[PDB]
């Protein structure tokens, strides 16, 4: 239940993704868990809110993360790749231009088990999650943020 | 199928971070299934 970044594991064992614990709520991408319940030690975490089009899901309570990219500053991907310690990768986002407005995007290509890793602004707030994107052969991830 | 979580760190900015990656500007569409696609 402690705040932090977590690996999402399945059973040998494999890392299928990453997520963020904040304010007692676990945040990850829908495609990582497909809404399955999660074990945390001897406890169980049940899905509370989810949305396939946003590709997001929260457990134990409503989505808590609300910071947004400022459109000018560098950000950090707090990548938690399979078999590797959590590490920070700094980058200037590009932009996804859509009919409904602009979304920050990071042109970083990490293993699929890194999906759900948080992207941070300079104050350390989570501005979105990594792992839903497009190919241009390089992958580019939206900075996907939910609604609080 | 047992799906479970393991803590991997604090959420903190690191001053000594590796820096990499471009900043492309891309026109995209988002469909009902959450899939982004390029548009021209």
Structure notes:
With 148 residues, chain A is mainly beta. Chain A is built from one helix and 15 strands. Chain A folds into two domains: 56 residues, Thrombin, subunit H (Beta Barrel); 68 residues, Beta Barrel (Thrombin, subunit H). Chain A has a five-stranded antiparallel β-sheet with strand order 1-2-3-7-6. In chain A, strands 9-8-12-13 form a four-stranded antiparallel β-sheet, with no helix packed on it. Chain A is globular and about 45 Å long. Chain B has one domain. A two-stranded antiparallel ribbon of chain B has the order 3-4. By secondary structure, chain B is an all-beta fold. Chains A and B meet through β1, β2, α1, β4 and β9 of A and β1, β2, β3 and β4 of B. β9 of chain A pairs parallel with β2 of chain B, so a sheet runs across the interface. Chain A: This is Genome polyprotein. Chain A: It is found in: Host cytoplasm, Host perinuclear region; Host endoplasmic reticulum membrane; Host nucleus; Secreted. It is classed as viral protein.
Q: Biggest sheet of chain A: strands, sense, closure? A: 5 strands, antiparallel
CATH names the topology of the largest domain in chain A as Thrombin, subunit H
| CATH class wording of the largest domain in chain A | Mainly Beta
Number of helices of chain B: 0
CATH architecture label name of the largest domain in chain A = Beta Barrel
User: Strand percentage of chain A, roughly?
Assistant: over 45%
Q: Which helices and strands, and how do they pair?
A:
The complex is a heterodimer of chains A (about 150) and B (about 40).
Chain A: E1 4-10, E2 14-22, E3 25-28, H1 30-33, E4 38-40, E5 43-45, E6 47-51, E7 56-59, E8 75-79, E9 87-91, E10 94-98, E11 101-106, E12 118-120, E13 126-129, E14 133-135, E15 139-142
Antiparallel strand pairs in A: 1-2, 2-3, 3-7, 4-5, 6-7, 8-9, 8-12, 10-11, 11-15, 12-13, 14-15
Chain B: E1 3-9, E2 18-19, E3 25-30, E4 36-38
Antiparallel strand pairs in B: 3-4
PDB class: viral protein
Keywords: NS2B-NS3 Zika protease, ECBL-96 fragment library
Assembly: dimeric
